[PDB]
Design a protein around this nucleic acid. Sequence first.
RNA 1: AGUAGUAACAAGAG
RNA 2: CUUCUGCU
Lengths: 14, 358, 736, 103, 17, 734
Amino acid sequence: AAAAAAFAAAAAAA
Amino acid sequence: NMKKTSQLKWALGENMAPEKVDFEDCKDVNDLKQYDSDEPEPRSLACWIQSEFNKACELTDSSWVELDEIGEDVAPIEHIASMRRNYFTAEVSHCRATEYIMKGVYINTALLNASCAAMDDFQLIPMISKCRTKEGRRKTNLYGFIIKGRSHLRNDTDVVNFVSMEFSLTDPRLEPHKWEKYCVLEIGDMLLRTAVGQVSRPMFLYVRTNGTSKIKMKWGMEMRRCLLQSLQQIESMIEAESSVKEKDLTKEFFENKSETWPIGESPKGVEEGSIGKVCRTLLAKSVFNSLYASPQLEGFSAESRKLLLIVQALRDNLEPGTFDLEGLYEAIEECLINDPWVLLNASWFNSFLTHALR
Amino acid sequence: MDVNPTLLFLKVPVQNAISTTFPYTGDPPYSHGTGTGYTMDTVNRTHKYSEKGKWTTNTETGAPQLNPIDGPLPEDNEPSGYAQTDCVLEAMAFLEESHPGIFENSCLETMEIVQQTRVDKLTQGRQTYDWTLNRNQPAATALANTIEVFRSNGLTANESGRLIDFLKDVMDSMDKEEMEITTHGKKKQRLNKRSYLIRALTLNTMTKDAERGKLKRRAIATPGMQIRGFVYFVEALARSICEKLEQSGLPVGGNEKKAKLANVVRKMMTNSQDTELSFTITGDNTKWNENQNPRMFLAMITYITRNQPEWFRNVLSIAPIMFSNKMARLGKGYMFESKSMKLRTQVPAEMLANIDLKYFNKSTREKIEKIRPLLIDGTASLSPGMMMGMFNMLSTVLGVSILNLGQKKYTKTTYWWDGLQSSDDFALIVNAPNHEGIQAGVDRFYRTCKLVGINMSKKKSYINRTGTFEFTSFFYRYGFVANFSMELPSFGVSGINESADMSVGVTVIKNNMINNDLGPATAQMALQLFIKDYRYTYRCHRGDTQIQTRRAFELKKLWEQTRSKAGLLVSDGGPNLYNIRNLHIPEVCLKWELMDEDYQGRLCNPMNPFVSHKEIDSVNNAVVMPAHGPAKSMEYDAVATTHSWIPKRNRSILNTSQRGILEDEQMYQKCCNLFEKFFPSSSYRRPVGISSMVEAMVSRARIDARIDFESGRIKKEEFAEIMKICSTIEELRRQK
Amino acid sequence: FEITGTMRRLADQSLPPNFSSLENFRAYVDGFEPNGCIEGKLSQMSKEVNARIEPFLRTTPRPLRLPDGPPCSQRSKFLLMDALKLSIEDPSHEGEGIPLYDA
Amino acid sequence: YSPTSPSSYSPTSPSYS
Amino acid sequence: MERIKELRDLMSQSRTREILTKTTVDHMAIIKKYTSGRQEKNPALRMKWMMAMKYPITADKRIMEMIPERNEQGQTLWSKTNDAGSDRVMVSPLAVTWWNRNGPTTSTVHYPKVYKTYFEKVERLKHGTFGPVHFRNQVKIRRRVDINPGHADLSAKEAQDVIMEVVFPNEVGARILTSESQLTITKEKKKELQDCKIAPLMVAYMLERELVRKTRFLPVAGGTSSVYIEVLHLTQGTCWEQMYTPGGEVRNDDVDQSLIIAARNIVRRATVSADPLASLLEMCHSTQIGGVRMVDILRQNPTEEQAVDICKAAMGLRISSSFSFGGFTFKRTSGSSVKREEEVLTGNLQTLKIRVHEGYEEFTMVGRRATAILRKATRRLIQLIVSGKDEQSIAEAIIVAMVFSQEDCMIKAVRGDLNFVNRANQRLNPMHQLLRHFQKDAKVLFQNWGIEPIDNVMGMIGILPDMTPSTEMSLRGVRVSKMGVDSTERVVVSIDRFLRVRDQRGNVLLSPEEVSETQGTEKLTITYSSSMMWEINGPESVLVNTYQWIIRNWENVKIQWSQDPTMLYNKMEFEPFQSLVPKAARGQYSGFVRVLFQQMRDVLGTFDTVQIIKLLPFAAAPPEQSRMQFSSLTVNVRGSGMRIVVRGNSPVFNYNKATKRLTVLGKDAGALMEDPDEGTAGVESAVLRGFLILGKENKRYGPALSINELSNLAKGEKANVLIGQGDVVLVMKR
RNA sequence: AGUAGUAACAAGAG
RNA sequence: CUUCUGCU
Ligand SMILES: *O[C@H]1[C@@H](OC)[C@H](n2cnc3c(=O)[nH]c(N)nc32)O[C@@H]1COP(=O)(O)OP(=O)(O)OP(=O)(O)OC[C@H]1O[C@@H]([n+]2cn(C)c3c(=O)[nH]c(N)nc32)[C@H](O)[C@@H]1O
């Protein structure tokens, strides 16, 4: 059930 | 090109520079001394500079600034800017100071081009300026001639000498200290007309050997910037009020003349001029700054700016306080030495202090 | 009816009309002749302001040195450099307490910078003192010459390409017993360890030309290549620290600076108690550079680098150590004349130490007599003070530390203070219950500054009610006032090239409309005046004009040939189509829809010989110096067109001994330009590799030849010829 | 990255007067803790070094003293108000534009 | 619009008759 | 092929051979810029001087074969002389003109494709629309704005990766394209750059311009989008605004952001109105976003936001009741909470004022790669169930949930160099800074969050700080579901008069209290078309325009204040200003100012025009009687509480007596006409509630007193009070 | 002579 | 003399 996330302003963790 | 005669070779200072030799070759010369580095000779103020400034803020018919056409106006803001610009151009194009700008820019441009081109030859340069009379006919005026000398300008501060001859109708003996560097010759009986019928006032040719530097020439050919410094300020004075009243106040300030600013003094007291007179006065001030630019003007401008800020704070009831007032006054007074423009500016500042604290 | 523009201030507030008080429409006062007098005066003043310090003699350079640190306290308002180390350390400690972890985080970032910084970074900037020639040279040239000299002397650790290795090489060179340099007749010169040290710590001195607002001229100094390496790391650390300081307005610039100052001042005014009277002090600090002792910067660097690795502390502290031992080169010298014999002559500054005093005037004679004891090998020892210090950020940090010390938790009194500081300029806000409190706070701030050596200039400073002030020529009157006179010199023809000038001129007009309050009518007239000046400068008047110029024939022919006149560029005599609507559109794109196809193709032909492309760092970028401040990089939008040519270069070096250097430059270009034909990305991204250029180019040629053969872009005969040539090149390199 | 040799001697020499070694100074700074040195020095410093604020009132500023030497003389590159212009009401001759012809 | 202000043979721009 | 021949020739020469052999590729970067020519320190004069000489330009040596040495007029186009320091010959500008006149022509269809950044400006200016020019009191604030928007789906690295691959496909190196966007852009550029002879450096520079995002600090007053910043000079002036609508399409994100800012300003302004629903409907029907009416935009753009949804409910559209936080769409399924500012100290000693939410609440988070069910209380995460598709997604969702919790254990987990104020010293959103910091590094937060035992439940698996799942231990209140979590749906709602949205069962879903209080800036310019054209502007503009309106209508306001002040206070022109006064102190300030005006009217004379102008906007809200005395009144401005001093001048509100001009926040507001009725005569009567300021102290009635201490006086007695900026004055209690 | 102002220019190196 | 140069 792939879904979007509307507004977003984040990058990937490490 | 002019023939290298003895008169030109003297007036143009040819061979006046001492021959350059290594120190090991002349270390034993009895009079060998370092270059003279004394302070400039002090001089007092005279009424001629104030009279000249008054004349420069006058209105004439000969327009001096015909500006190439810009792209077609489309945006409503562009139409408003064009409508204002019209008033600015009409008010600043007929000002005498604009005449000084056009003639000065042409003279410096011609001198720089001739200096770079004919480095080793004396050149005759007419002082031609173009204007448009009231009836719209285009008229070409000649103010005199300039003989440019050797122009081997290496450094930006090197000097090129030139002999300037200017036609005039003025008795030098009437006011001699104004023409201390000039040699005035009576050359004719000009049939000026007046209204009675005609006056035969004699033409006086002011022949003087002047000198200009490369940097001075470059800044001289950019004298048109004066038209910006004054007009921008004027626009800032218009746009502020328009912001307050939320209406274009160009017509109110120029035609209706509803608002006036204190721009001069007379026996009756401070005189107030319209926006047009303010614009002409600011333009004349900027033009004279360009014509009489010098280090003294820069120093006095900075120090007097500090004093002006202090006086403004006092006027605004900000309880201004100084740590060393005499030190600031000394700094201002050390910059008043020889330049007539700086002396006039100091006199103007004294008048402002007199009028701003009473 | 004597008109007087100054009377206009009777109605308009001075700040709102401040532009009127700027004479920037006239030529700036240049400096004539040598800067030796100003340099000697600066040295004498620097030593006089610290005359009560301890005199010592260096065991390495042998020159006298002055240590004013911890000297007597100032007994008069006369400028004093006797900074107290304990007070400086206490100020730094309080700064750290007020902003916990500032030094730790700044050190962590600065450290990383040190690890990742390459040697090429020293190429940025200009006019560095090349110790191999005793003359100012471009940063890249001085760096290359120093690298070549080091390699010839056995210092071969700089090949890693890391700046820290070059610094290590500098250190080893400092320990070298003898140095070998080349001169050109390509002679060889040997320098002893002492002489090397003196010429490695030497600072060249010149005069600050075109400076406005000052009557008397001044002297500026440029350091050598050795010092620049450590100065870069010290400035990077100071910048990292300043970015975290609210009162430090130095690292930021442009609108970002004005925004920071407006926000900071606003908050400062806000948090102030309603019952507390507030005042603002505006003014510079007298003799800022002459009194900032390098030992204080060493103390601050040591305190900042506490707990950091020893290598980091050493690399950061090397710069202040070298600056404390710095020697200033006197300069060009002096000029003498004989009126009776009518002949001129020049005495180099190196001869002033032995020349007779009868040739000088009273002022210069006194200056020479006062500097003679400090004169060593033509250079004057300058241990005290910081001649044209590059530690602008470090000095700003020190000033901010003094400013931060004015919090109510540090003053332990009713009065308190805060403010802004950038280099030597500052604006201090003092809050106190009453005027007595304000006076006590001002006195305490002044005395504390004296403690650190900083000293407010009572001559050019004033205090008024809070709300209006001046900071770095920005006039705040309940909000920064848009001064336009400062940007006037930026108008007119920039002078880059025929194409960059137009884009820069319209960009300047647009920027001034956005930032410096340029009205639309004034913008129009400005645009008109600029086009007129542009046409009169590049001789690009309109084709239908009757004006006579040496370039009038070609323009006239082009105008007659073109069918759509409006499409011609202004540089080709075309009509001007700019206005407020399109000041942001490059003229090539603006007229593209109107340009004739033949002319459009000729003008934008990529094979044209006039267009040249350097590194991307210098593509569509220009260096512009405004009325105040240093040079700034301006980026302009312009299309590559035949008008984007390059002006002629100065050939005065063509008839001097150093002409060989220019030739070498030519050779280098002849090689670098060839490498671009082998590695196309050489300009877009810096190439890397330890192999010799010839090896890389030959290898790439072999690979490309094979790939082209396999793809069929070349024939069998062409491939055979290529390899034959490659084998010949390999043999040529081996044969030598 | 070690400081040694000539660098070490230079570092040892570029320190406050009461110090004689770089390591000694670094150790002193590492162990330094504020103990009111500023308050003590401020108390010790003479009371005559102060920024006394003299009030600026309407009667304080006097006029600027201008020089008393000989009267100033014209120094412009060209005449401003005394200039006389010889002009042609309308340029209609051959060679219009060249300054020599018009002159 | 005419630039105007409440303030023969001008020595600058005269007549010749 | 001739490059190898040139290399052989260079090798043949001894000096060139030595240079090529000794200089490594690494050393090339240093010798590449090895020149003798020092950067010009005065380019304008040098250019003006060199244009006079015969050959100021330098051209490639090739020109000698492409241009005749002299034209038909005999003028020399070039010279055999070689430029100093290169092989370029020295040529005159006549050569450039000759080339442009009859030089070799080529096709130029590639230029619009390579210079797309410059040509798009012309294309969008050609289709732009110009509205009326309105003269106003423009208040331009300095902030960071977009110069080149770049590509929204590519970062710096991604942009360079495409650039390199498109311009120098062989020199790409080890880098590899790893995104559909990168592949599509690379394919399109390669298709467009077929047979392009333009210099590769220019192609790379233009591609960098078009792709890498660039921002700069500019004084803006309108939209901050690139399409608007480029024409900033034309649109926003110092005393005017030009309604402009740039051509082409607008980014959906810009429209969404602008709509959010406009809706938030509208609801904040309409909340202080007497009829909030009617005011909101009128504002929404009059407002336009980038030339598009907001009324028709709300019906097509969801932009879930506590304000957008409200506006939609007012308009009758179905709302989403969801808000986006950290890339996750949160839907409040149950519970309610109330915002309140709280002061906290982070792990790096920084102090922050965060908007803590009180009350138990339950949310559903939907993300592009995760979905979670969250249940939180006041600064505490009760439970969290994540159903992320990937381990990285699980970590991202957990970090977002922890930051959203606002738990103290997370605030104390902040470590290293974290700044809550930018280089311009502006105050950033603490939640965003925390989210960014913890997404950059979450090891510390996971370590310090805490661990709890796991109740064995089918389908629920715990997760440990090292990210490895465990069945016996897990992070405090954290579970991972492998079966998925359920879903977006719009529910019709009813909105009452006071903007309190309720569902079909009457449960209140949205209220104006939860709308964010941050006064942001719109990406796309917002235009208002009502008489009060500054109704929805920012704080500084609202204040300046409010006082400007008061001064312009002073001839009538004075009469109304002197005759019917109760009706004047209710004038709509003061409602926007009330939006800036704090909600808690609104009534106190209104009552205080109303009493001050009444006491000024009772005491004959003592009229003070400046005091009335300054305090009039504070009387609009309903009165709330109190014994409190205010020395200054606070107004919110971009998160800062500006204090207006009741007595005296302040930087926020100043009256220059010399020019008789009012300045608000440094912007001129107008001149006050000379009023013969003023007659201050020393006594103020408008500084303290129920007290008259007699004047200068005399050291007889008392040494000094505080503003609150003055309440001790009963009646008639006189005493000295320290009121204002250290100005002690004599006062009398009625 | 003149420019100009704390030191130059009034050509310089071959 | 001629050559070379106007920021080196
Ligand atoms: O760039 C701005 C905003 O544009 C104005 C933009 N933005 C939001 N939504 C969208 C969108 O859908 N599409 C686009 N393109 N842009 C969007 O996001 C940025 C938000 O900036 P800012 O105004 O500083 O954020 P703000 O609205 O003030 O608050 P924020 O921190 O993001 O919080 C968002 C909502 O979450 C509520 N909230 C936070 N917490 C911790 C809780 C809580 O614990 N309980 C409840 N019930 N709510 C919480 C915030 O209050 C706010 O409502």
